[PDB]
Amino acid sequence: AQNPNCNIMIFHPTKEEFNDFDKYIAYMESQGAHRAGLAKIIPPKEWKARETYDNISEILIATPLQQVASGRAGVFTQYHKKKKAMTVGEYRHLANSKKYQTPPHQNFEDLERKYWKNRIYNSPIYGADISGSLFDENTKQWNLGHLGTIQDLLEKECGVVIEGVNTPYLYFGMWKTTFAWHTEDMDLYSINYLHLGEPKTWYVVPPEHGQRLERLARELFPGSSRGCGAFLRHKVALISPTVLKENGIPFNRITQEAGEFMVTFPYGYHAGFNHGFNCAEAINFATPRWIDYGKMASQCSCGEARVTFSMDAFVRILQPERYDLWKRGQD
Ligand SMILES: O=C(O)CNC(=O)C(=O)O
Ligand SMILES: [Mg+2]
Ligand code: NI
Numbered sequence: 001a002q003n004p005n006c007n008i009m010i011f012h013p014t015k016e017e018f019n020d021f022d023k024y025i026a027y028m029e030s031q032g033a034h035r036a037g038l039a040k041i042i043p044p045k046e047w048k049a050r051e052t053y054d055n056i057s058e059i060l061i062a063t064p065l066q067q068v069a070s071g072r073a074g075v076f077t078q079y080h081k082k083k084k085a086m087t088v089g090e091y092r093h094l095a096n097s098k099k100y101q102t103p104p105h106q107n108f109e110d111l112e113r114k115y116w117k118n119r120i121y122n123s124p125i126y127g128a129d130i131s132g133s134l135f136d137e138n139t140k141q142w143n144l145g146h147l148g149t150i151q152d153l154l155e156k157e158c159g160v161v162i163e164g165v166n167t168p169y170l171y172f173g174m175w176k177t178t179f180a181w182h183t184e185d186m187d188l189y190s191i192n193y194l195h196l197g198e199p200k201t202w203y204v205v206p207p208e209h210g211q212r213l214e215r216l217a218r219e220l221f222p223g224s225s226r227g228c229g230a231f232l233r234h235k236v237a238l239i240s241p242t243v244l245k246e247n248g249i250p251f252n253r254i255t256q257e258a259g260e261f262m263v264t265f266p267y268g269y270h271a272g273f274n275h276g277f278n279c280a281e282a283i284n285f286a287t288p289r290w291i292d293y294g295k296m297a298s299q300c301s302c303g304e305a306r307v308t309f310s311m312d313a314f315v316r317i318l319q320p321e322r323y324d325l326w327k328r329g330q331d
C-alpha cells in the first residue's frame with residue numbers, strides 16, 4: 001500500500017505531465033497521495049496562471065464576512081457577520097491596516113503559535129465564496145475554470161444526465177481568516193490555487209480516520225451535535241493541533257504559498273488559516289473514485305448548511321433514500 005502513514009505528498013509535474021489534469025490526479029493517487037486527504041502540486045516553472053495581478057482592485061466583495069469567535073483558544077466556533085460591500089483594493093488596504101495586519105514573526109511556526117494563541121480575540125474579515133476566476137482564458141493547463149464538470153463525470157460514470165453547473169470561487173483573505181473543519185459538499189475533491197499574497201496553512205485528517213475527528217467534534221461541541229447529526233457541514237467549528245494531539249487524532253499540516261495548488265481528496269477533513277492578505281481560487285471536482293464517497297456522504301438536514309443548486313441532483317441520484325429529508329432541510 002502506497003503512503004501507509006498518510007503523509008501529505010508534494011508533487012512537481014513537468015510541463016508535459018501538466019497537460020492532462022485527470023491523468024495527473026490518477027498518478028498522484030497511484031502514489032498514495034489521497035491517503036493524506038491533501039496534496040500539494042507545484043506547477044512547472046514554464047506555467048503561469050495569468051500575466052499579472054496588477055489590475056484586480058476593482059473586483060467587488062459584495063458581502064465581506066467578519067469571523068467572530070466563541071469558545072476557548074483551541075476549541076471554538078465562528079459565526080460570519082455580514083459587512084458592507086467593498087472592493088478588493090479597499091479590502092487589501094484594510095488587511096494591511098494596523099488593526100488587521102500580520103504581526104511580526106520569525107517563521108511560519110512562530111506565526112502558527114500566534115494564530116492559535118490569539119485568534120479568538122480578534123474578528124478578521126474574509127471575502128469568501130465569490131463566484132469568478134483569475135485564470136487567463138489562454139492558460140490551458142490547470143485552469144480551474146476549464147475543468148471537466150462534476151455533472152459530466154456523474155454522467156460518464158453512471159449514465160444519468162443531470163442539471164447543474166460547477167464554477168470556481170475566489171477567496172480574499174487576511175491575517176487570521178479561518179476555514180473551519182469540513183469535508184467538501186458530497187465529499188467531493190477540491191482544488192485550490194493561491195494566486196497571490198501571503199500563505200495559507202492547512203490541517204488535514206486522513207480520509208480513513210475521518211470518523212475519529214467526527215467523534216471528537218461531537219464531544220467538544222455537544223449542543224451542536226444534538227442539533228444536527230452532521231454539524232461539521234455548517235463549517236463553523238475549530239479544533240487546534242494541540243487539542244487534536246491531546247485526543248490522539250491523526251492529522252498533518254502544511255503551508256501553501258503563492259503559486260502553489262492544493263488538492264483535497266474525498267472525505268479529507270481540512271481546516272486552516274491565512275497569514276495575511278491573499279487571494280485564492282478553488283473549485284470542486286470529481287473522478288471515478290469519488291462516486292462511492294458521494295453515495296456515502298453525510299448530510300445536514302437541520303437547515304443550517306444550505307448549499308448550491310447543483311447539490312440537489314447529486315443527492316437525488318446518489319442518495320435517493322435521503323433525498324426527501326435533505327430537501328426539507330433546504331426548503
Ligand atoms: O481557502 C479557503 O478559505 C477554504 N478552501 C477550501 O476549503 C478548499 O479549497 O477546499
Ligand atoms: Mg479590477
Ligand atoms: Ni474545503
Ligand SMILES: [Zn+2]
Binds near residue numbers: 230233300301
Ligand atoms: Zn445541520
